[PDB]
Curated annotation (Swiss-Prot):
Bilayer disposition of the protein: Multi-pass membrane protein
Stated family: Belongs to the archaeal/bacterial/fungal opsin family.
Species this protein is from: Halobacterium salinarum (strain ATCC 700922 / JCM 11081 / NRC-1)
Positions marked as site (Primary proton acceptor): 81
Gene (UniProt): bop
Protein name, per record: Bacteriorhodopsin
Subcellular location: Cell membrane
């Protein structure tokens, strides 16, 4: 098939198979348990992205959805990816500031809504409805960013300065990265079609890798992961 965006997928596969491995060996070296599970979580988060990017590299998780008179190419392997990785990364932040069970259930439940409506909206055939789904989804995301920015950050201050200090950085990678996502969906292949597909995969690879591997390196690298 040799699609123009395969380059960026072959590239995604490589940066995540490589991140997954670095995490995995470093993780099996640690003896602390509190810190030990920040390592399993990251080995798993990179690993899921990895089988997905590669599988896509290989022509799976791609489907043609009709709308706007075209036969639009929708990569759904992305939502299977995000479905499991986004709630776990939120789990990374919740363990860190000692979240309640209630707040974690809520962040996860809303996260399920983000991706579920994201996917539905990306498989819709009526052009204006795609955008109703994109919108309930984004609203879910703003909600999660709200909690994190207002709730978690009130609570990262019951921690040590090294923990709040670390939470502020990861919290800042999240807010910046997670919010570009709805803007890319919408100007590219799933939304307006302004940005062609090789450039979309290229921007989703950079947010993905930044957000999983850039995130893991910063987290696993801090003193705060030792309870
Ligand atoms: C490793 C992947 C990460 C951190 C993915 C984050 C993904 C999002 C914040 C996705 C958001 C979306 C919307 C706000 C609306 C339209 C559809 C989505 C699912 C692309
Ligand atoms: C828990 C929230 C479930 C929300 C389902 C909303 C469906 C809205 C459909 C609007 C179609 C025009």
């Amino acid at each position: 098939t040799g699609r123009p965006e395969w380059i960026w997928l072959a590239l995604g596969t490589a940066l995540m198979g490589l991140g997954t491995l670095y995490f995995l060996v470093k993780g099996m070296g640690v003896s602390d348990p509190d810190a030990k599970k920040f390592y399993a979580i990251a080995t798993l988060v990179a690993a899921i992205a990895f089988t997905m990017y590669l599988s896509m590299l290989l022509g799976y998780g791609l489907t043609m959805v009709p709308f706007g008179g075209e036969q639009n190419p929708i990569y759904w392997a992305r939502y299977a990816d995000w479905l499991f990785t986004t709630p776990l990364l939120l789990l990374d932040l919740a363990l860190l500031v000692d979240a309640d069970q209630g707040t974690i259930l809520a962040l996860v439940g809303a996260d399920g809504i983000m991706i579920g409506t994201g996917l539905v909206g990306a498989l819709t055939k009526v052009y204006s409805y795609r955008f109703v789904w994109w919108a309930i989804s984004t609203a879910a995301m703003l909600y999660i960013l709200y909690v994190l920015f207002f709730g978690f950050t009130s609570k990262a201050e019951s921690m040590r300065p090294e923990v709040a200090s670390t939470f502020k950085v990861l919290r800042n990678v999240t807010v910046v990265l997670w919010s570009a996502y709805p803007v890319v969906w919408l100007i590219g292949s799933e939304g307006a079609g302004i940005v062609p597909l090789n450039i979309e995969t290229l921007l989703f690879m950079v947010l993905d890798v930044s957000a999983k591997v850039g995130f893991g390196l910063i987290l696993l690298r801090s003193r705060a992961i030792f309870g």
